[PDB]
């Protein structure tokens, strides 16, 4: 714990589908949570996972 902010500890908010046991995932592809295709880094229903 650091008062200045040790926010290098990152974790997955949500995933397209649940992963099988002992299946590490490192991909950082922007997930789409809507009908519109996910275009660019950011967009509607496009969030960093």
């Amino acid at each position: 714990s650091k008062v200045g902010g040790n926010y290098n500890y990152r974790y997955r908010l949500f995933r397209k589908s649940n992963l099988k046991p002992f299946e590490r995932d490192i991909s950082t592809e922007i997930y789409q949570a809507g009908s519109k295709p996910c275009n660019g880094v950011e967009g509607f229903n496009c969030y960093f996972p």
Partner: protein, 49 residues
């Protein structure tokens, strides 16, 4: 017309089928926030009032 915060409308909804997809997949809205339940599975989960 929408009343301001002085007298906020408290509309009651029951005894009907609710299609949250239309509001979920509409670009005519600014913000849509809630963590109590994932908005994707609103339609399948039922409610009383």
């Amino acid at each position: 017309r929408f009343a301001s915060v002085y007298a906020w409308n408290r509309k009651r909804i029951s005894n009907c089928v609710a299609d949250y997809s239309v509001l979920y997949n509409s670009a005519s809205f600014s913000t849509f926030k809630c963590y109590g339940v994932s908005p994707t599975k609103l339609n399948d989960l039922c409610f009383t009032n």
